[PDB]
RNA sequence: UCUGGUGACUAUAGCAAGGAGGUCACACCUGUUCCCAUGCCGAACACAGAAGUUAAGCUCCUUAGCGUCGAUGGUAGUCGAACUUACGUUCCGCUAGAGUAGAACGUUGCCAGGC
RNA sequence: CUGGGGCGGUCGCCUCCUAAAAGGUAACGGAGGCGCUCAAAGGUUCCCUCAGAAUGGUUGGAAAUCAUUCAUAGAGUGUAAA
RNA sequence: UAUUGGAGGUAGAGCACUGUUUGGACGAGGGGGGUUACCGAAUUCAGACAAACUCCGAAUGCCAAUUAAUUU
């Protein structure tokens, strides 16, 4: 098994299961996480809060809707009608 | 940097645990905190 | 209030006709003057800062704010945030009176062949000039001073370019 | 001004012998040698100057 | 040579920075104020529907007079308070624009406060 | 400078386009002032003759259906391998 | 003359070689060009051989443009070692060429001399080639 | 459509240029005694005022120089399938990026004074 | 553990690529970090806007500070990377 | 499966950032206080390269639906 040649890099960290966690159109309950991220790839919208780890979660019960903010930004909102 | 126990000056209880740098803060730090025994904010000291 | 009256009595009269202005507002009004000394070798010392305080504290009527070094310049010991440089701006009647005194005391100690100089310019209408603390403090003698420095002076005017600055220097200045 | 930090200035009367260019100012709060009114009642600290006597361009 | 600028744009920039938290609903409308060199306006705005519920100004004939422009702010506070009370709005949220919180704007808010507007 | 073309119809598949190109005819479109967008095909040899006749820039009379359009070649796609024109753009001036 | 060469990473995944040439498919500097009709790696040492062959056949005549550059480094494990224990050291530098890429351009010389020079260069090269002219029309 | 607030749209909204515009006041301006005011200016902030000016800001009209938008057609790629071991081929859907013609020097809700 | 063992290297956590546009995903694959720091570098309120470039200047190692116009954020964000 | 909405940056493209690059214009700094060749860059023109580049960006997979058809 080879010899004195060895590698200095076989390291990685544990992957964090980030990304979207709910879909447009589906009803969710309040407190449901909608999007895990680092920084703000997606901003909180209507009735959506932003956690200390930048997690986006629903504030009330209702349907989730991803929307544009302006030219190059996105947001997620929750709307009450059920 | 060392651990610190903050003891209520009035109640007497050791209510909070925090940290400090022993060179930047070479004294017994004091700050106002909520003593749950007396239901009020009292002075706590590093004791 | 000498050049204060002189503006509206001679400059707003003659410059308004030498260069045409449709309304009375393009009369190039001198706004303020900045008198930053510059940089002294004030890294092993911290007292020539107080001397540059006494100057510009005594000549002009305001103590100079000691602006700190923005970046950590190499070679010389410039720590980001290490104090080098003074600054005062005159705007009101103090500005007029300071200019009037300056044009009355520049030439005697300046020894300038022109009288002050011809042009040291940023190509846009302001001095950023150099001095050797000769013309300044006629009020207080040289016997009580410690160094030799010269301020970075400019002219903030409603004018546009150095061409107009030459026309406006006619107020007992020497272009 | 760059005020906030400021002592007492004054429009002093630099009434020198060379056209009395008392259109000047400074903190030279000395004794009023000539408490005149065409110029300020301040000290004529400017005593001798060539600013209006000998100009190497227009002498 | 520097440029003097109109102060309304810097005001409006701070105003957008302050409107990020400030928003008017119907139950709690937003009391905006616009301050100029001579006059000040103020409106009761519902942002949830983008409508103005009440309005007052120092230009207004029923309030225009010769005063020190702070007493006028006091009058506009009372007038906007009365209009809101007539329409049935008690609790509001005060939008200061970007004009600090002082002088005329402070007097305006205070005058609204003595006249019923709960904020 | 009197090139003629044939009106292409809708939905030409990949196979249709390559069978068209394997002959001596190329797809092209015409657009511009005085007309609407029309997709046509022109024989490659005749196009080459017309271009060497009137040049790279030259008001070519293009026969589309029944009508002749005063048109110029705005752009064209070339295949450096097996040197051959693959598509042409014709813009109408009049 | 060249630039000071240094790469951000010295050990890179080997290039994709399937497909057609992305760009550089036309003669744009010179009058004649040598284009590839198959795909291989060109190893910064075939380029120098081909360039010497061409420029020496023209006797310092027209201009030569090398349209391909060896950006990609490749590694080779030392002799007589087992599999694994990391990645080998850099052996050399390659450019991947695909069918259609113009490899060399020449100008300031007759068509016959250019054709002969590009033939000679093509023989020093691990790819099938074709002589092309500045495309017009 | 007027002017000033305010707010809804991905700059089609912007930059730049040339030219008009004057108390509805929008700004400019006069000053610091008045709250305030600025490590460091009545600069700014704040205040008292309305005597000079459309000059500038702002509002309006033109322009595609700039930024922004942008098809159709074709191409690259590719889901599936049929061949095949070729740096492949064929058929059927989907269908870019770049570029081209072109669009575009804003639309719009509420409120107040104007008309 | 190991492209047989031994020798060499490695062993837990973080960031990236490999990773095939959800998530996940291996190799003794390719790169780096961590075992802290800060009583303000935390909370809140109110203000502020950057690097650089010349049109440049008493210094002028060039560029210290200072002056004016552009500066899409290229600066800074306690630290590795995203 | 059909229809609609959404998250995301792969193939491909592209050079707007990070960096590698080949020719050509243009003026200029140490330097043959300057010339002049150049040399290090300022600014442009045309061409290319990238797993740890992206102004862009599919096919498909993925999540879910007031919902339909067929199945189990």
From Swiss-Prot, chain C:
Pfam families: Ribosomal_L5 (PF00281), Ribosomal_L5_C (PF00673). GO terms for cellular component: ribonucleoprotein complex; ribosome. GO terms for molecular function: rRNA binding; structural constituent of ribosome; tRNA binding. GO terms for biological process: translation. Gene3D superfamilies: 3.30.1440.10. Coiled coil: none annotated. The keyword Secreted does not apply. Keywords: Ribonucleoprotein, Ribosomal protein, RNA-binding, rRNA-binding, tRNA-binding. InterPro entries: Ribosomal_uL5, Ribosomal_uL5_bac-type, Ribosomal_uL5_C, Ribosomal_uL5_CS, Ribosomal_uL5_dom_sf, Ribosomal_uL5_N. NCBIfam families: PRK00010.1 (NF000585). Belongs to the universal ribosomal protein uL5 family. Part of the 50S ribosomal subunit; part of the 5S rRNA/L5/L18/L25 subcomplex. Contacts the 5S rRNA and the P site tRNA. Forms a bridge to the 30S subunit in the 70S ribosome. This is one of the proteins that bind and probably mediate the attachment of the 5S RNA into the large ribosomal subunit, where it forms part of the central protuberance. In the 70S ribosome it contacts protein S13 of the 30S subunit (bridge B1b), connecting the 2 subunits; this bridge is implicated in subunit movement. Contacts the P site tRNA; the 5S rRNA and some of its associated proteins might help stabilize positioning of ribosome-bound tRNAs. This is Large ribosomal subunit protein uL5. It comes from Staphylococcus aureus (strain MW2).
UniProtKB/Swiss-Prot annotation, chain E:
One of its GO terms (biological process) is translation. InterPro entries: Ribosomal_uL18_bac-type, Ribosomal_uL18_bac/euk. Keywords: Ribonucleoprotein, Ribosomal protein, RNA-binding, rRNA-binding. One of its GO terms (cellular component) is cytosolic large ribosomal subunit. It comes from the Bacteria. GO terms for molecular function: 5S rRNA binding; structural constituent of ribosome. The keyword DNA repair does not apply. The keyword rRNA-binding applies. Part of the 50S ribosomal subunit; part of the 5S rRNA/L5/L18/L25 subcomplex. Contacts the 5S and 23S rRNAs. PANTHER family: 39S RIBOSOMAL PROTEIN L18, MITOCHONDRIAL (PTHR12899), LARGE RIBOSOMAL SUBUNIT PROTEIN UL18M (PTHR12899:SF3). NCBIfam families: L18_bact. Belongs to the universal ribosomal protein uL18 family. This is one of the proteins that bind and probably mediate the attachment of the 5S RNA into the large ribosomal subunit, where it forms part of the central protuberance. This is Large ribosomal subunit protein uL18. The lineage of its organism: Bacteria, Bacillati, Bacillota, Bacilli, Bacillales.
From Swiss-Prot, chain F:
It comes from the Bacteria. Coiled coil: none annotated. Belongs to the bacterial ribosomal protein bL25 family. CTC subfamily. This is one of the proteins that binds to the 5S RNA in the ribosome where it forms part of the central protuberance. Part of the 50S ribosomal subunit; part of the 5S rRNA/L5/L18/L25 subcomplex. Contacts the 5S rRNA. Binds to the 5S rRNA independently of L5 and L18. This is Large ribosomal subunit protein bL25. It comes from Staphylococcus aureus (strain MW2). The lineage of its organism: Bacteria, Bacillati, Bacillota, Bacilli, Bacillales. The gene is rplY.
Swiss-Prot record, chain G:
Residues 1-19 have a biased composition (Basic residues). Transmembrane segments: none annotated. Keywords: Ribonucleoprotein, Ribosomal protein, RNA-binding, rRNA-binding, tRNA-binding. It comes from the Bacteria. One of its GO terms (cellular component) is cytosolic large ribosomal subunit. GO terms for biological process: translation. GO terms for molecular function: rRNA binding; structural constituent of ribosome; tRNA binding. InterPro entries: Ribosomal_uL16 (IPR047873), Ribosomal_uL16_bact-type (IPR000114), Ribosomal_uL16_CS (IPR020798), Ribosomal_uL16_dom (IPR016180), Ribosomal_uL16_sf (IPR036920). Coiled coil: none annotated. Residues 1-23 are annotated as: Disordered. The keyword RNA-binding applies. Part of the 50S ribosomal subunit. Binds 23S rRNA and is also seen to make contacts with the A and possibly P site tRNAs. Belongs to the universal ribosomal protein uL16 family. This is Large ribosomal subunit protein uL16. It comes from Staphylococcus aureus (strain MW2).
């Amino acid at each position: 098994k080879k010899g004195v040649s060895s590698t200095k890099n076989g390291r990685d960290s544990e992957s964090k299961r980030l990304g979207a966690k709910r879909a447009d159109g589906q009803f969710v309950t309040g407190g449901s996480i909608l999007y895990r991220q680092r920084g703000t790839k997606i901003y909180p919208g209507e009735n959506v809060g932003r956690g200390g780890d930048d997690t986006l979660f629903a504030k009330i019960d209702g349907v989730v809707k991803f929307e544009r903010k302006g030219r190059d930004k996105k947001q997620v909102s929750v709307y009450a009608v059920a | 940097r060392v651990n610190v126990t903050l003891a209520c000056t009035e109640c007497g209880d050791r209510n909070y645990i925090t940290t400090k740098n022993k060179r930047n803060n070479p004294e017994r730090i004091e700050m106002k905190k909520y003593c749950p025994r007396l239901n009020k904010y009292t002075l706590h000291r590093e004791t | 209030n000498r050049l204060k009256e002189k503006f509206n009595t001679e400059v707003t009269e003659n410059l308004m006709k030498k260069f045409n202005y449709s309304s009375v507002m393009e009369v190039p009004k001198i706004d303020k003057i900045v008198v930053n000394m510059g940089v002294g070798d004030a890294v092993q010392n911290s007292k020539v800062l107080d001397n540059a305080v006494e100057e510009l504290e005594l000549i002009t009527g305001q103590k100079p704010l000691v602006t700190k070094a923005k970046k950590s310049i190499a070679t010389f010991r410039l720590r980001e945030g290490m104090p080098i440089g003074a600054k005062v701006t005159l705007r009101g009647e103090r500005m007029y009176e300071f200019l009037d005194k300056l044009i009355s005391v520049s030439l005697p100690r300046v020894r300038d062949f022109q009288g002050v100089s011809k042009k040291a310019f940023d190509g846009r209408g302001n001095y950023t000039l150099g001095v050797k603390e000769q013309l300044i403090f006629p009020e207080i003698d040289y016997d009580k001073v410690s160094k030799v420095r010269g301020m970075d002076i400019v002219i903030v005017t409603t004018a546009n370019t150095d061409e107009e600055a030459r026309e406006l220097l006619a107020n007992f200045g020497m272009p | 001004m760059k005020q906030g930090i400021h002592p007492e200035y004054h429009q002093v009367i630099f009434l020198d012998t060379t056209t009395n260019f008392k259109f000047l100012s400074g903190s030279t709060k000395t004794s009023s040698e000539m408490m005149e009114w065409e110029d300020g009642k301040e000290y004529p600290v400017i005593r001798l100057d060539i600013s209006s006597d000998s100009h190497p361009f227009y002498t | 040579m520097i440029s003097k600028i109109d102060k309304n744009k810097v005001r409006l920039k701070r105003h957008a920075r302050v409107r990020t938290n400030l928003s008017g609903t119907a139950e709690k409308p937003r009391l905006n104020v616009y301050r100029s060199n001579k006059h000040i306006y103020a409106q009761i705005i519902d942002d949830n529907k983008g409508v103005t519920l009440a309005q007052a100004s120092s230009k207004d004939s029923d309030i225009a007079t010769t005063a020190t422009k702070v007493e006028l702010a006091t009058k506009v506070g009372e007038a906007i308070a009365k209009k809101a009370a007539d329409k049935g709005i008690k609790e509001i949220v005060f939008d200061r624009g970007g004009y600090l919180y002082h002088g005329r704007v402070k007097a305006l808010a205070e005058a609204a406060r003595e006249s019923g507007l709960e904020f | 400078a009197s090139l003629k073309s044939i009106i292409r119809q809708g939905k030409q598949t990949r196979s249709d386009l390559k069978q068209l190109r394997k002959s001596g005819k190329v797809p092209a479109v015409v657009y511009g002032y005085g007309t609407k967008n029309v997709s046509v095909k022109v024989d490659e040899v005749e196009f080459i003759k017309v271009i060497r006749e009137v040049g790279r820039n030259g008001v070519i009379e293009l026969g589309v259906g029944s009508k002749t359009i005063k048109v110029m070649v705005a752009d064209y796609q070339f295949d450096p391998l097996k040197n051959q024109i693959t598509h042409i753009d014709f813009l109408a001036i009049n | 003359m060249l630039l000071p060469k240094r790469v951000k990473y010295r050990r890179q995944h080997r290039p994709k070689t399937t497909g057609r040439s992305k760009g550089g498919n036309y003669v744009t500097f010179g009058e004649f060009g040598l284009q590839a009709t198959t795909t291989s790696w060109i190893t910064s040492r075939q380029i120098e051989s081909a360039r010497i062959a061409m420029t020496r056949y023209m006797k310092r005549g027209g201009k030569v443009w090398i349209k391909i550059f060896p950006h990609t480094p490749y590694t080779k494990k030392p002799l007589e070692v087992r599999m694994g224990a990391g990645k080998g050291a850099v052996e050399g530098w390659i450019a991947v060429v695909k069918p259609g890429r113009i490899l060399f351009e020449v100008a300031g010389v007759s068509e016959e001399v250019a054709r002969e020079a590009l033939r000679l260069a093509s023989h020093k090269l691990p790819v099938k080639t074709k002589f092309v002219k500045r495309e017009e029309l």
